[PDB]
Amino acid sequence: SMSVKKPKRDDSKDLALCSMILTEMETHEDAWPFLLPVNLKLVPGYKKVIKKPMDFSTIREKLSSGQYPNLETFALDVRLVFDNCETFNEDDSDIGRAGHNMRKYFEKKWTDTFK
């Protein structure tokens, strides 16, 4: 509360470390469904059904331009990519499996870097 603060967690490396995690996600062999925005002209249903589209390239641009106020807002966009994937794709599809694999990969890197 006013003039009463918990001890200052060092956040000065967070930008660098989110960039490294994002690099690792970009270079994973199962990243291909997620590298670019879904083409809303060419994929029936996507525009209407997925209210907040997100992809790695869009997270990368946001990251590079100071659009994440903190590391939690970065984790929310990454998770959004996988939550959108599960909303639109059957679990038993190459893309559905890709999304599950990538979410697991991400959550381990997140825990090991920050928790």
CATH fold label, 1-115: Histone Acetyltransferase; Chain A (1.20.920)
The answer to whether 86 and 52 have CB atoms below 8 angstroms apart is: no
Q: What is the largest CA-CA distance in the chain?
A: 55
Q: CA 33 to CA 56: how far, in whole Å? A: 10
Token couple for 34: 């997620």
Q: Which residues of 7-30 are buried (b: 16+ CB within 10 A; e: fewer)?
A: eeeeeeebeebbeebbeebeebeb
Q: CA 43 to CA 87: how far, in whole Å? A: 14
**Angle 42-100-43 (CA atoms, 0-180°, nearest 5)?**
5
Q: CA 84 to CA 58: how far, in whole Å? A: 14
